[PDB]
């Protein structure tokens, strides 16, 4: 829905890599609006366990499992552009 926003000046000064910047993306960058009903916001039911959802999750997870070996052979520039394409397709869907 929206990208995380980093207010931190040292983090904005230094962070460059993919995960090394992503570890600085916290809940306070827009997601944590006011925070008084957090315990109700994290008590969760598990009614998704159905037939077609579980097989779709399994087939896509194994697809990722089989292709993630080429992901580590990518460069920083690739990872950023590929994940931008993935985010654009995800909001499209």
């Amino acid at each position: 829905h929206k990208k995380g926003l980093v207010e931190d000046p040292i983090y904005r000064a230094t962070k460059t890599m993919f995960t090394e910047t992503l570890q600085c993306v916290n809940v306070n960058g827009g997601w944590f609006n006011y925070g008084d009903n957090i315990d109700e916001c994290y008590k969760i039911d598990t009614s998704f366990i159905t037939d077609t959802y579980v097989k779709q999750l399994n087939r896509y997870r194994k697809k990722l499992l089989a292709t993630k070996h080429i992901w580590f052979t990518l460069g920083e520039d690739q990872k950023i552009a590929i994940l931008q394409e993935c985010r654009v397709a995800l909001m499209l869907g």
Partner: peptide, 9 residues
């Protein structure tokens, strides 16, 4: 020169 968050600095 710092490598952590600004809060701990």
């Amino acid at each position: 020169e710092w490598e952590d968050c600004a809060e701990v600095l």
